[PDB]
Every structure is written in structure tokens, then in C-alpha cells.
């Protein structure tokens, strides 16, 4: 019940999430504001 990005910062999943962060830093440009909404099916 603790964040993976804190307990094991060198896990593969956290590396993939850092890749997602770098993707977002370019995707989230020229957006009308700085709000991100993560949803699902």
C-alpha cells in the first residue's frame, strides 16, 4: 500500500512511467491549462 515510485524507484515500471513523463512534457504543451485527467474503460 505504498507508491512503487517511492519504495522501488529503480523498477522497470517506474522507468516506463518516466518515459511517459517525457512524452507528456512535450504533448502537454500548448494546452489550454495544466490539468491532466487519467481515465479508463
Amino acid at each position: 500500500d505504498t507508491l512503487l515510485a517511492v519504495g522501488n524507484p529503480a523498477d522497470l515500471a517506474v522507468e516506463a512511467i518516466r518515459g511517459l513523463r517525457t512524452s507528456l512534457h512535450f504533448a502537454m504543451m500548448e494546452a489550454k491549462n495544466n490539468v491532466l485527467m487519467i481515465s479508463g474503460a
Binding site: 524507484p9 529503480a10 522507468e15 518516466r18
Partner: protein
């Protein structure tokens, strides 16, 4: 690493290859947060200089 973390200057990192003819900057000590270090603006300052 020792430059990105801020505990070194831009001049003590550059060394000369013996049988080469080009300078180089080694990684240094392995950090615990590489990808988070590389985002520091000092990296861009180093490249611009």
C-alpha cells in the same frame, strides 16, 4: 554526474585522450537518479558553453 549534481565546475570534467586528439567527459560516479539529473538546466548550459 559530479557536474550535473552541482559539486563540480565545467573545467575539471574535460580530459584528453592519449592516442586520440579529442576531449572527453566521462560519466563519473553512477548516480541513483540519472534520468532526473539529465533534466537539470546545467546540462543545457554545459552544451551551450
Amino acid at each position: 554526474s559530479e557536474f550535473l549534481s552541482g559539486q563540480a565546475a565545467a573545467e575539471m570534467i574535460i580530459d584528453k585522450v592519449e592516442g586520440g586528439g579529442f576531449d572527453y567527459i566521462g560519466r563519473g560516479q553512477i548516480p541513483p537518479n540519472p534520468a532526473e539529473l539529465l533534466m537539470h538546466p546545467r546540462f543545457e548550459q554545459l552544451l551551450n558553453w
